[PDB]
Structure 1
Amino acid sequence: GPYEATWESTDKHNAAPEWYRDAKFGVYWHWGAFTTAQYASEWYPRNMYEPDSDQRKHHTETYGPPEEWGYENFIKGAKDKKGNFVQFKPVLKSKGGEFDPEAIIKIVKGSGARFAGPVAEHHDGFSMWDSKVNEWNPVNYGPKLDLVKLWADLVRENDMKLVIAMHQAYNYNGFFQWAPKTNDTSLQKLLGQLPRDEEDQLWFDKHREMLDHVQPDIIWNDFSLDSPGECGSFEGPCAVDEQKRLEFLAYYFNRGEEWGKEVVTTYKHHDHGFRNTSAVDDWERGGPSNLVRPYWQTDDAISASSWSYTVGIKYYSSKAMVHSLLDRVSKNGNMLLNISPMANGVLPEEQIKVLNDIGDFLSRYGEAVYDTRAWDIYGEGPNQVEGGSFTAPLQGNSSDIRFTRNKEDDVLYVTVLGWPEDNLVSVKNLGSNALVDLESLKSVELLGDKAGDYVKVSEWEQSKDALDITLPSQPAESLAYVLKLTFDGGIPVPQPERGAAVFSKADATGKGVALALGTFDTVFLTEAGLKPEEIRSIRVSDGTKATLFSGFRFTGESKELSAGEHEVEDGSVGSIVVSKI
């Protein structure tokens, strides 16, 4: 194929194709031999060995000292301290068991997911397809099933794109640091104890074999691709050999071409292992606090605990999952939601309810979500994501709105995260302070009880503070409500309270992009719809300054502009920093 194992060659791959930007919502599942103990988290295989840990205590009391009853026993099977046989060994419903993958995929489809799939290999060294390069797999041991193939075939049968999650870098970069050393070369492969060159080759060989086996539309990667300092006390680079990363990218992108498919690979945002030229950044739980470009995604989980099922696990609400999805989508990302089947393969009813409720929202209000794109301002209101460390998912109310818009850029969806008791929705960024002319606002409609229903909104006034919209009779109850605002000739460009707006014509008219406080490089401005060479004017808000750079990313000649309107020379700007005075 055309791709070579170099950064320059693989940079040319289109990171986020249109189908992926259209998709918005997907589902995957942390289910595997790491679930067998149903204790603590999916990191149980690592922590069962940790000195003085609660997981080691539990393991020692339940199974045996981890030096005698090692993690491999969950895969190969062994009796616990009370004499019960323990093994990851799901039994198909068609064979009289409880594992019903077909039912689970129907539930996932019903949730409105447009991409779905398994964790194919976590950190624990267990490849869940029929693997020749890794004997530690569920065809050789346990259920005698190619779980990844089973899932993939069902995902395709149900008209969803296939995502496969792979976490096999941390396996040999410290996950198993507390496991006993072994001279058994098979056990070394499970526990990441092979020579590092062999481990680096195996990282690639696992990817290669898996992706040829099931032809994934998305390959999702966890950390330790190149994330120095992130592997705790283990002495090592917290990384995969650079050559092997490049060989993976070229191999996958070449197979995509061969298959006639636009494929995607993701990596953790903070990780340096891939580049945002050809791979999609995957943000930490909660996502970014702001609207980020280029297109990105984030993972989340129903569980209020672990990513893998544990006894006593608690869950978040349907409302929080839906409001979180809206928030991510408004900020120019997708949300990949993790679910957590029990070790026997059963999906708990609380999780099914959440998925049903998300699907009930998306089947009704999908117009405001699927196939849309971010506006230049993601939303308004008091309830926000802080970013950084996660605590609990976003839950908004009638005070909060999130924006999305259509591809034609003449329809703005205003989604309010609760029913206003005062029957009023006030959109600040469409008020007069926002310097917005509403002459072109042709209609305002409330989306109704079923998709394709619209209830006309008759009364609205534009104040200084906001477009003040009076709502009609409340439709059937839902977790959020959607207003559809149709303009002729395009949505107006708002002036942020503190911020700026750039324009393609010299007098603050034409195509434009609103900017918050922050840093906006050539990629940002281009994706937002105005290549910076085409900027010919800028309006800087009161209390704000803008610094223009000739360079792509805040280098080169610079110029500072205070509050007001300014003309810009064609081709003079590459990037912009917008700051509070």
Structure 2
Amino acid sequence: GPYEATWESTDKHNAAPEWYRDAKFGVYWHWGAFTTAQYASEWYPRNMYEPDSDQRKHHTETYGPPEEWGYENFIKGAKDKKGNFVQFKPVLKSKGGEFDPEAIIKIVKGSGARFAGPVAEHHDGFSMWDSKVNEWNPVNYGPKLDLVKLWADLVRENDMKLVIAMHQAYNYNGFFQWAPKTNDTSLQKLLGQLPRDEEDQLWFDKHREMLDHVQPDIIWNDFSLDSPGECGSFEGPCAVDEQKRLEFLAYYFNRGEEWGKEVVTTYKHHDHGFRNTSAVDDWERGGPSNLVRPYWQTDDAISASSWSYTVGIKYYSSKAMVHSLLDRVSKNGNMLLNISPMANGVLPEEQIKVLNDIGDFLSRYGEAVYDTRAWDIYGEGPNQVEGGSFTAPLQGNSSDIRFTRNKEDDVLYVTVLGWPEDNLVSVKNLGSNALVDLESLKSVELLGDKAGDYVKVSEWEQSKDALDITLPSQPAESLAYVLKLTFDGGIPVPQPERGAAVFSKADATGKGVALALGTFDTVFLTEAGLKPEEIRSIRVSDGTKATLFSGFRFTGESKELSAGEHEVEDGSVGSIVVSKI
């Protein structure tokens, strides 16, 4: 294909294709030999060896000292201290067992997921497809099933895009740092003890083999691609060889061309291993506090404590999952949710209930989520996420709004995260302090009990503070409620209380983009709908200043502008910093 293994070549790949931006919600699952112990977390293979750890204590009490009863015994099978045979060995329901992958995929489809798939290989050295490059796989050992192909075929049967998650970099960058050294070269491959050049080649070879095997639409990657400092006390670069990373990107993007598919690869947003030119940034167990461009995603888990099933595990509420989805989508991201089957392949009913509830929401209110795009302001209200990876899911109430809009940019969806007891929704960013003219607001509708049904909202007034909307009769109960505001000729450009707005015409009219406090480079402004060379005026809010830069990303000649309206020379702006005074 046309891609070469260089940054410059692979940069030209379209990172986030339109189907992926339309999709919004996906589901994957950490299920593998690391689940076998059903203890602590998916890091059990690492921590069972850790000096003085609870996991080591548990392991020693249950199986044996890890120096004798090593991690590989979960894959190959061994008796525990009470004589019970232990092995990762799911058995299909069609064979009399408890593993029903078809039922799990139907549950996932029912949740509203538009992409789905397995962790194909975590940090633990176990490839879960029929692998020639890695003998540590579930066709050779355990269930004698190509689990990744089974999942992939079922995802395609059920008309979802296929995501495959790969975490095989940390395998040799410290995950197994406390495992005994071995001279068994097969066992070295499991435990990440091969020579580093061989491990770097194996990282690529695993990707190549997997992606030719199941042709994924998205390849999700974990950290240690190039994340120095993130691999704890292990002495190493916490990285994959740069050449092998580039070979992966070129190989996958070339296969995408060959297959006639727009493919996606993701990586952890703090990791430096790929570039946000051609790969999508993934925020782990969290997401930004602000609207971020370019398009990004969250991957979060149904449990706070683990990605993989453990005995006694507790789960987030449906409310937290739906409100968090709305938050990410409003901020220009997708949300990929991890679920956690037990070692025997059963999906616990508490998890099924969460997925069912998400699906009830999306099947009713999907118009406000699927196929939408972020507005320029993501939302309003007192309940907000902290921002960053490893932060708490959102749980909001009737005081909170999240915005989305249609592709035609003349419908604004106002999603309220609870039913207002006062029967009032006040939208601050559509009030007159926001300098919003509502002459073009043609209709306000409440989305009803099933998709495509609307209840007319007849009473509203625009105050200084807000567009004050009086609600019709409460529809069937739901985790959030959606107002649909339809405009003649496009949604108005709001003036943030603190922030700015930029325009394509010289007099603060025309195409516009509202900006919060923050830093907005050429990529941001372009994706928001206004190439910076087309900016011809800016309105800076009270208590705010804006600094215009000629450069792409806060370099070059700069000019500071205080509160008020200002004309801007065509082709003079590349990026903008909006700051509180």
Q: TM-score range by the shorter chain?
A: over 0.9
Kept in 1: contact 2:287–2:389 (CA 8 A): no
Could you list the per-position Cα deviations for residues 473-519 of structure 1 after superposition, in whole angstroms to 9, with x for gaps in the alignment?
A: 00000000000000011000000000000000000000000000000
Could you list the per-position Cα deviations for residues 500-550 of structure 1 after superposition, in whole angstroms to 9, with x for gaps in the alignment?
A: 000000000000000000000000000000000000000000000000000
Could you list the per-position Cα deviations for residues 438-486 of structure 1 after superposition, in whole angstroms to 9, with x for gaps in the alignment?
A: 0000000000000000000000000000000000000000000000000
Secondary structure in 1 matching 2:433: coil
Between the aligned partners of 1:392 and 1:460, the Cα distance in structure 2 is 35
Could you list the per-position Cα deviations for residues 64-112 of structure 1 after superposition, in whole angstroms to 9, with x for gaps in the alignment?
A: 0000000000000000000000000000000000000000000000000
Between the aligned partners of 2:402 and 2:544, the Cα distance in structure 1 is 24
C-alpha displacement of 1:212: 0.1
Kept in 1: contact 2:386–2:392 (CA 8 A): no
Between the aligned partners of 1:476 and 1:256, the Cα distance in structure 2 is 43
Between the aligned partners of 1:322 and 1:574, the Cα distance in structure 2 is 37
Between the aligned partners of 1:388 and 1:537, the Cα distance in structure 2 is 33
Q: Is 1:429 aligned to residue 429 of structure 2?
A: yes
C-alpha displacement of 1:301: 1.1
Secondary structure in 2 matching 1:120: strand
Between the aligned partners of 1:467 and 1:543, the Cα distance in structure 2 is 23
Between the aligned partners of 1:525 and 1:137, the Cα distance in structure 2 is 46
Kept in 1: contact 2:385–2:392 (CA 8 A): no
Between the aligned partners of 2:417 and 2:49, the Cα distance in structure 1 is 45
C-alpha displacement of 1:305: 1.7
Between the aligned partners of 1:367 and 1:393, the Cα distance in structure 2 is 23
Could you list the per-position Cα deviations for residues 278-322 of structure 1 after superposition, in whole angstroms to 9, with x for gaps in the alignment?
A: 000001212100000000001111113210000000001001000
C-alpha displacement of 1:390: 3.2
Between the aligned partners of 2:155 and 2:530, the Cα distance in structure 1 is 38
Moved more, 125-134 or 389-398: 389-398
C-alpha displacement of 1:251: 0.1
Percent of aligned pairs with the same amino acid: 100
Kept in 1: contact 2:504–2:536 (CA 8 A): yes
Secondary structure in 2 matching 1:387: coil
Between the aligned partners of 1:140 and 1:191, the Cα distance in structure 2 is 17
Q: Which residue of 2 aligns with 1:560?
A: 560
Between the aligned partners of 2:285 and 2:547, the Cα distance in structure 1 is 32
C-alpha displacement of 1:338: 0.2
Between the aligned partners of 2:212 and 2:149, the Cα distance in structure 1 is 11
C-alpha displacement of 1:236: 0.4
Secondary structure in 2 matching 1:251: helix
Between the aligned partners of 1:302 and 1:41, the Cα distance in structure 2 is 13
Secondary structure in 2 matching 1:508: coil
C-alpha displacement of 1:388: 3.2
Q: Which residue of 1 aligns with 2:163?
A: 163
Gaps of 5+ in 2: none
C-alpha displacement of 1:393: 1.4
C-alpha displacement of 1:392: 3.1
C-alpha displacement of 1:389: 5.5
Secondary structure in 2 matching 1:323: helix
Q: Is 1:272 aligned to residue 272 of structure 2?
A: yes
Secondary structure in 1 matching 2:165: strand
Between the aligned partners of 1:499 and 1:392, the Cα distance in structure 2 is 27
Secondary structure in 2 matching 1:303: coil
C-alpha displacement of 1:391: 4.9
Q: Is 1:177 aligned to residue 149 of structure 2?
A: no
Change beyond 3 A, Cα 1:106–1:484? same
Between the aligned partners of 1:185 and 1:281, the Cα distance in structure 2 is 35
Between the aligned partners of 1:483 and 1:361, the Cα distance in structure 2 is 14
Between the aligned partners of 1:242 and 1:213, the Cα distance in structure 2 is 24
Q: Which residue of 2 aligns with 1:251?
A: 251
Kept in 1: contact 2:540–2:546 (CA 8 A): yes
Secondary structure in 2 matching 1:433: helix
Q: Which residue of 1 aligns with 2:331?
A: 331
Between the aligned partners of 2:388 and 2:356, the Cα distance in structure 1 is 29
Between the aligned partners of 2:63 and 2:305, the Cα distance in structure 1 is 23
Kept in 1: contact 2:283–2:389 (CA 8 A): no
C-alpha displacement of 1:578: 0.2
Kept in 1: contact 2:285–2:391 (CA 8 A): no
Between the aligned partners of 1:224 and 1:171, the Cα distance in structure 2 is 9
Structure 1 runs of 4+ with >6 Å offset: none
Kept in 1: contact 2:129–2:138 (CA 8 A): yes
Between the aligned partners of 2:388 and 2:212, the Cα distance in structure 1 is 36
Secondary structure in 2 matching 1:546: strand
Could you list the per-position Cα deviations for residues 545-566 of structure 1 after superposition, in whole angstroms to 9, with x for gaps in the alignment?
A: 0000000000000000000000
Between the aligned partners of 1:494 and 1:356, the Cα distance in structure 2 is 36
1:147-546 correspondence runs (5 A): 147-388=147-388, 390-546=390-546
Secondary structure in 2 matching 1:246: helix
Could you list the per-position Cα deviations for residues 396-417 of structure 1 after superposition, in whole angstroms to 9, with x for gaps in the alignment?
A: 0000000000000000000000
Between the aligned partners of 2:179 and 2:304, the Cα distance in structure 1 is 29
C-alpha displacement of 1:27: 0.1
Q: Which residue of 2 aligns with 1:12?
A: 12
C-alpha displacement of 1:184: 0.2
